[PDB]
Scaffold this active site. Sequence first.
Site, PDB file in Angstrom:
ATOM      1  CD  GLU A   1      39.758  41.461  47.412  1.00 48.49           C
ATOM      2  OE1 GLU A   1      38.712  42.130  46.833  1.00 48.49           O
ATOM      3  OE2 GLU A   1      41.092  41.083  46.210  1.00 48.49           O
TER       4      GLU A   1
ATOM      5  CG  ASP B   1      38.955  43.126  38.252  1.00 52.17           C
ATOM      6  OD1 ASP B   1      39.468  42.757  39.090  1.00 52.17           O
ATOM      7  OD2 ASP B   1      40.078  43.354  37.255  1.00 52.17           O
TER       8      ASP B   1
ATOM      9  CG  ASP C   1      37.444  55.387  33.041  1.00 53.00           C
ATOM     10  OD1 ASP C   1      38.614  55.400  33.863  1.00 53.00           O
ATOM     11  OD2 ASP C   1      36.278  55.785  32.955  1.00 53.00           O
TER      12      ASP C   1
ATOM     13  CG  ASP D   1      48.512  41.798  37.985  1.00 55.62           C
ATOM     14  OD1 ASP D   1      48.248  40.327  38.793  1.00 55.62           O
ATOM     15  OD2 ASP D   1      47.887  42.611  37.386  1.00 55.62           O
TER      16      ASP D   1
ATOM     17  CE  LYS E   1      60.084  39.836  32.289  1.00 54.62           C
ATOM     18  NZ  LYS E   1      58.992  39.318  30.647  1.00 54.62           N
TER      19      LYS E   1
ATOM     20  CB  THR F   1      41.846  35.574  46.645  1.00 54.37           C
ATOM     21  OG1 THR F   1      42.465  34.792  46.128  1.00 54.37           O
ATOM     22  CG2 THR F   1      41.512  36.558  48.282  1.00 54.37           C
TER      23      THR F   1
ATOM     24  CD  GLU G   1      44.277  33.058  51.367  1.00 49.04           C
ATOM     25  OE1 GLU G   1      43.732  34.098  50.703  1.00 49.04           O
ATOM     26  OE2 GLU G   1      44.601  33.491  52.054  1.00 49.04           O
TER      27      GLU G   1
END
Length: 204
Positions: free
Chosen positions: A37, A62, A89, A111, A115, A184, A187
């Site tokens: 994930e 992450d 990183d 995310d 824009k 999540t 969620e």
Amino acid sequence: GATELLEANPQYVVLNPLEAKAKWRDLFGNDNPIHVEVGSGKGAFVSGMAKQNPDINYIGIDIQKSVLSYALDKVLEVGVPNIKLLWVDGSDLTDYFEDGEIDRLYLNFSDPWPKKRHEKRRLTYKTFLDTFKRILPENGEIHFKTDNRGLFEYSLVSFSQYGMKLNGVWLDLHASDFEGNVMTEYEQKFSNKGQVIYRVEAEF
């Protein structure tokens, strides 16, 4: 001390790609499929999935050490072996995984970057797709869910234009007969709102 907590816990957390790439099966200690994930937040999803599926190995990835440390708190509590957390990183994921080293990829509530000039930052943009196609096997799949309509509309078109096939599309996930959904934190937080959740399984 996020970095400190992560470093003290090498049984769960991987910090440098040199001790990851081509080594993931050795790290888990078996040849079970590896499901990753990207942007795993505070670890509810990878934890719940590892519990549902003991014979699948999960990696929660992450870019932020802080939020990965919260995932770790959750992961330490559960105490099951079929999870690892990876801090990335900023480089492409090809620095962390060999071609075909993983078996499925999950994207949850990524995310949206609404824009137009930030298109390139969306995880469903073609350059990320290039990376995901490499690390997944032939015919490998991305399972993607979000409540962000704009992002989901964009990602369906991005996937399709890239040449991926859409195998399933859910336009109200919680109202469907889909089973095994693991929520999540985001969620959960918003479950009471009752806004539709979108989901797609797409294949390279």
